[PDB]
Every structure is written in C-alpha cells, then in structure tokens.
Design a protein around this motif. Structure first.
Motif, PDB file in Angstrom:
ATOM      1  N   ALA A  60       0.828  -1.216   0.000  1.00 66.18           N
ATOM      2  CA  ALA A  60       0.000   0.000   0.000  1.00 66.18           C
ATOM      3  C   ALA A  60       0.870   1.277   0.000  1.00 66.18           C
ATOM      4  CB  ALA A  60      -0.930   0.007   1.186  1.00 66.18           C
ATOM      5  N   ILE A  61       2.011   1.279   0.728  1.00 68.03           N
ATOM      6  CA  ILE A  61       2.982   2.398   0.773  1.00 68.03           C
ATOM      7  C   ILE A  61       3.590   2.538  -0.613  1.00 68.03           C
ATOM      8  CG2 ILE A  61       5.247   3.150   1.756  1.00 68.03           C
ATOM      9  CD1 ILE A  61       4.289   1.664   4.429  1.00 68.03           C
ATOM     10  N   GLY A 115       2.044   1.798  -3.284  1.00 69.11           N
ATOM     11  CA  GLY A 115       0.871   2.343  -3.962  1.00 69.11           C
ATOM     12  C   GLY A 115       0.662   3.830  -3.738  1.00 69.11           C
ATOM     13  N   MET A 116       0.825   4.358  -2.490  1.00 69.54           N
ATOM     14  CA  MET A 116       0.670   5.804  -2.282  1.00 69.54           C
ATOM     15  C   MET A 116       1.886   6.576  -2.812  1.00 69.54           C
ATOM     16  SD  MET A 116      -1.112   7.545   0.897  1.00 69.54           S
ATOM     17  CE  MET A 116      -0.879   9.375   1.268  1.00 69.54           C
ATOM     18  N   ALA A 149       1.270   6.763  -6.742  1.00 72.67           N
ATOM     19  CA  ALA A 149       0.066   7.596  -6.968  1.00 72.67           C
ATOM     20  C   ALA A 149       0.333   9.060  -6.663  1.00 72.67           C
ATOM     21  CB  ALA A 149      -1.100   7.098  -6.144  1.00 72.67           C
ATOM     22  N   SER A 150       1.095   9.342  -5.604  1.00 73.38           N
ATOM     23  CA  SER A 150       1.488  10.692  -5.249  1.00 73.38           C
ATOM     24  C   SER A 150       2.442  11.253  -6.315  1.00 73.38           C
ATOM     25  CB  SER A 150       2.142  10.705  -3.871  1.00 73.38           C
ATOM     26  OG  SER A 150       2.554  12.020  -3.543  1.00 73.38           O
ATOM     27  N   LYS A 155       2.575  10.413  -9.605  1.00 71.31           N
ATOM     28  CA  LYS A 155       1.800  10.716 -10.806  1.00 71.31           C
ATOM     29  C   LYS A 155       1.187  12.115 -10.629  1.00 71.31           C
ATOM     30  CE  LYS A 155       0.774   6.145 -12.737  1.00 71.31           C
ATOM     31  NZ  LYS A 155       1.535   5.245 -11.821  1.00 71.31           N
ATOM     32  N   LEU A 156       0.557  12.359  -9.455  1.00 71.38           N
ATOM     33  CA  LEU A 156      -0.021  13.661  -9.117  1.00 71.38           C
ATOM     34  C   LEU A 156       0.990  14.795  -9.219  1.00 71.38           C
ATOM     35  CD1 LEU A 156      -2.638  14.018  -6.296  1.00 71.38           C
ATOM     36  CD2 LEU A 156      -2.674  14.966  -8.505  1.00 71.38           C
ATOM     37  N   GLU A 183       3.730  14.786 -11.037  1.00 72.65           N
ATOM     38  CA  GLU A 183       4.148  14.837 -12.448  1.00 72.65           C
ATOM     39  C   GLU A 183       3.152  15.627 -13.334  1.00 72.65           C
ATOM     40  OE1 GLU A 183       4.817  10.675 -12.721  1.00 72.65           O
ATOM     41  OE2 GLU A 183       7.008  10.890 -12.613  1.00 72.65           O
ATOM     42  N   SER A 184       1.832  15.485 -13.090  1.00 74.11           N
ATOM     43  CA  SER A 184       0.834  16.245 -13.842  1.00 74.11           C
ATOM     44  C   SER A 184       0.967  17.754 -13.520  1.00 74.11           C
ATOM     45  CB  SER A 184      -0.576  15.737 -13.566  1.00 74.11           C
ATOM     46  OG  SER A 184      -0.910  15.817 -12.190  1.00 74.11           O
ATOM     47  N   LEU A 185       1.410  18.096 -12.278  1.00 76.10           N
ATOM     48  CA  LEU A 185       1.658  19.478 -11.866  1.00 76.10           C
ATOM     49  C   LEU A 185       2.798  20.044 -12.687  1.00 76.10           C
ATOM     50  CD1 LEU A 185       1.044  21.763  -9.520  1.00 76.10           C
ATOM     51  CD2 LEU A 185       3.156  20.917  -8.604  1.00 76.10           C
ATOM     52  N   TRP A 215       9.384   8.613   0.657  1.00 74.74           N
ATOM     53  CA  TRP A 215       8.570   7.421   0.373  1.00 74.74           C
ATOM     54  C   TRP A 215       9.484   6.229   0.050  1.00 74.74           C
ATOM     55  CZ3 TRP A 215       3.793   6.561   1.627  1.00 74.74           C
ATOM     56  CH2 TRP A 215       2.828   7.576   1.637  1.00 74.74           C
ATOM     57  N   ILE A 243       7.511  14.604   5.842  1.00 77.57           N
ATOM     58  CA  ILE A 243       6.773  14.857   4.603  1.00 77.57           C
ATOM     59  C   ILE A 243       5.817  16.037   4.796  1.00 77.57           C
ATOM     60  CG2 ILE A 243       4.899  13.140   4.915  1.00 77.57           C
ATOM     61  CD1 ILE A 243       5.896  12.353   1.850  1.00 77.57           C
ATOM     62  N   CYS A 286       5.192  19.066   2.166  1.00 73.29           N
ATOM     63  CA  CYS A 286       3.844  19.363   1.734  1.00 73.29           C
ATOM     64  C   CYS A 286       3.549  20.838   1.979  1.00 73.29           C
ATOM     65  CB  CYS A 286       2.846  18.463   2.458  1.00 73.29           C
ATOM     66  SG  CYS A 286       2.837  16.743   1.868  1.00 73.29           S
ATOM     67  N   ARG A 341      -7.164  13.922 -17.127  1.00 73.85           N
ATOM     68  CA  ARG A 341      -5.915  13.308 -16.696  1.00 73.85           C
ATOM     69  C   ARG A 341      -5.712  13.588 -15.202  1.00 73.85           C
ATOM     70  NH1 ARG A 341       0.208  15.456 -17.531  1.00 73.85           N
ATOM     71  NH2 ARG A 341       1.318  13.523 -16.989  1.00 73.85           N
ATOM     72  N   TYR A 379      -4.715   8.643  -6.608  1.00 70.43           N
ATOM     73  CA  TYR A 379      -4.174   9.069  -5.333  1.00 70.43           C
ATOM     74  C   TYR A 379      -5.145   8.780  -4.174  1.00 70.43           C
ATOM     75  CZ  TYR A 379      -1.851  12.078  -1.844  1.00 70.43           C
ATOM     76  OH  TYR A 379      -1.287  12.530  -0.686  1.00 70.43           O
ATOM     77  N   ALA A 389      -5.377   4.869  -3.453  1.00 67.35           N
ATOM     78  CA  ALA A 389      -4.166   4.456  -2.729  1.00 67.35           C
ATOM     79  C   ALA A 389      -4.243   4.836  -1.233  1.00 67.35           C
ATOM     80  CB  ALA A 389      -2.940   5.069  -3.355  1.00 67.35           C
ATOM     81  N   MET A 434      -3.819   2.548   1.974  1.00 69.71           N
ATOM     82  CA  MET A 434      -2.935   2.630   3.144  1.00 69.71           C
ATOM     83  C   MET A 434      -3.741   2.713   4.447  1.00 69.71           C
ATOM     84  SD  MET A 434       0.606   4.567   3.286  1.00 69.71           S
ATOM     85  CE  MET A 434       1.438   4.965   4.927  1.00 69.71           C
TER      86      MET A 434
END
Ligand SMILES: [K+]
Ligand SMILES: [K+]
Ligand SMILES: [K+]
Ligand SMILES: [K+]
Lengths: 197, 197
Positions: free
Chosen positions: A31-32, A34-35, A38-39, A41-42, A44-46, A71, A182, A186, B20, B28, B31, B35
């Motif tokens: 799951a870690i 996985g986050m 997923a984090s 990808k988020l 990268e779109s920014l 992570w 983190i 953030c 996207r 996100y 995931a 967790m």
C-alpha cells in the motif's frame, strides 16, 4: 507428558500469529508502494501544467523530488528492517516443526520397545538382552529429540511478547519520522502555490 | 476565422489535462484508501497479540482509533473538496463540445447560403428575396453560436492556470495537516511500546 502437548499448542499458535503479521506487514508495504507511485503521478501532472516556468519551478521540482526520496527510503527501511527481522524469525519454525513430528514417532517406538517387557515376565536371556539393546537405543533417540524441544519451545514462546513489541516499535518510529518530515515538504508546496495565486 | 481554431486547440487540450488530473486524483485517493485499510489491519493484529491488558492498552486502542479517523477524514475532505470541484469543472466541457460542432455546421450553411450570391449576378426578384430570407436566417443562427463561444473559450482557458493552482494548494494543505497530525499519534504508539519493553 501432557506438559509438552501444551508447548506444541503454544508453538502452532505463535506460528500463525507470526505468518499473519508477515501477511499484514506485506499488505502495509505494498500500500505504501501504492501511495508513493500515486502521489508521484499527481506531482508529475503538476510539472506538465507549469510550462515555461512561473513563480518558483525550482521550489516545486525540489519538493516533488525529495517527497519521492522520503517514500522510497521509508519503504526500504521497513523492507530491510522490520520485514527481514520477521522473515528470519519465521524461518526458525519449519525445522522445529519437523522435529516435533520426529519426536512423536520416536515416542511410539520407545513405548513399543518398552511394552515388550512381557518378554521378562515368563525367559530367553539372548532375546531379553536383544530387546534391552533395542529399548536403550529407543530411549536415547527419544530423549535426544525430547531434551532439546523441552527447552526450545518455552524459550521461543518467551521471546514472542518482546518480538511483536520490538517490531511495532521500529515501525511506528519509522512512520513518525516519515510523516513528520513529509508534512514539512507538503507545506513548502502549499507556500509555493500561494506565491502563484 | 483561424483565431477560433486556436481557441478549439486550447479547449481540447484543457479538457485532456483536466480528465488526466481527475484520473490521477482518483488514483491518489484509492491508494489512500489502501494505506488506511492496510494500516488498520496492522493495528488490529497488535490488539490480538496484547491479551489480557499490559502496560497501556487504553493508550494503544485510542492511538489506533484516532489514526483511522485521520485517514477517514483526510480521504473524505479530498473527495468532498478538491475531487468534487474538479468533477463540476469538467462537467462544463460536454455542452461546450456540442456547441463547437453545432457552430461548425452553422458556418457551412452560412457559407452555402452566401455563395448562392450568383443568383444576384444575372435576375428573379422573388428568388433573390427568398435567398435573402435564408441567408439572413443562416447569418443570425451562426452568429448566435459564434458570439457566445468567442467569449467562453478564451474565458475558460484563463481560469485554467489558477484552477490547477487552487486544486494542488488545497491538496498539499490537507496532506500537510494529516501527516503533521498522524506523526504525533505514531510517536505516542512508540512511547507506549517503549513502556512495555
Ligand atoms: K519510484
Ligand atoms: K501532491
Ligand atoms: K475504515
Ligand atoms: K502501525
């Protein structure tokens, strides 16, 4: 006699608790992973919706960079730490398993060689002495397996309490240092966003 | 004429960037659900390996309880906040899509009704006036669709920059308050473990 059957019930349980903890620790690590992805990808779109460069791209790429590192390192410290420690601890069990079964048969052979005491309840001295050599041999074999396990089963069960305790201690402490660190990264991202808007 | 084709290239792009972002924001959130549940299984196995009650069970059940609440609320605030805001923003696009296509056909009908100007290049006055009524009608229909979109396409593209900026601001701020708060709960768990061992 029945005191050893209590050590087996304690071993078979301690084995289930441990394999269950490994399952649920592999679930938590997956799951870690996985986050983290997923984090990433988020973030990268920014980076895509930011071209050319406006109000701090160097303080967005840096935040997104060291977030992945936190992570990445946190997952690895749990893999090389508390998960490896739990794998090696569970590796103790298959050999003890084989020996608990071996002893059980060696107990039957001992009791069968012993019950053959009817031979010295007539007598043939050459057959008594032959049975003695097969009884003494069966008693030394059983006691070799039994003496070890009588020590090893309550000795494994004792390090059980402090084992689960040490696993969760190291986990909660890696969590705490990851979440505290983190939370700062953030906040830097938020402060760079507010600079823009 | 070609200035509107530039507004369409900007609309079709802004639509892809947005769908996207929705994909990767749903990735996100899924995931985080992952967790949360995986962390909860881990705390539940701790609660099993703790019977009867030793060196602070009330400060283990409380930590494990409000950890789930933080995960639960953080996921929901992203669902009811930044994800809903992004869904409603993307809901603007299918109607604008239909109208960009409608206008394109209304442009052909306008240009076909107009090119029929060869009629007044002989003339039959009853057929000129009939064509005038069909040209003026085609010009008013095209300009009804065109006038709106000429405003709405550069007006949607402008709120784009500050839209992605506001989404990531609210996300990074929910993250920061969740990670800063869970880091404390994780530390309390460690402090209860050290009390035991
Ligand atoms: K990675
Ligand atoms: K993020
Ligand atoms: K839940
Ligand atoms: K935990």
């Amino acid at each position: 006699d029945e005191q050893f059957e209590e050590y087996v019930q304690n071993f078979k349980r301690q084995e289930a608790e441990g394999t269950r903890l490994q399952r649920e620790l592999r679930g938590y690590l997956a799951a870690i992973k996985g986050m983290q992805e997923a984090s990433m990808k988020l973030t990268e779109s920014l980076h895509e919706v930011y071209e050319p460069d406006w109000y701090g791209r160097e303080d967005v790429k840096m935040v997104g960079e060291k977030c992945d590192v936190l992570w990445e390192d946190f997952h690895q410290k749990l893999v090389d730490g508390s998960l490896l420690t739990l794998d090696t601890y569970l590796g103790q069990f298959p050999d003890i398993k084989n020996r608990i079964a071996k002893r059980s048969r060696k107990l039957v052979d001992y009791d069968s060689a012993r019950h053959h005491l009817e031979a010295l309840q007539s007598k043939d001295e050459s057959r008594i002495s032959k049975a003695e050599e097969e009884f003494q041999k069966a008693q030394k074999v059983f006691e070799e397996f039994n003496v070890d396990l009588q020590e090893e089963l309550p000795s494994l069960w004792s390090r059980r309490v402090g084992f689960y305790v040490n696993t969760f201690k190291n986990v909660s402490s890696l969590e705490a240092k990851f979440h505290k660190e983190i939370a700062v990264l953030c906040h830097k991202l938020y402060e760079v966003m507010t600079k823009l808007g």
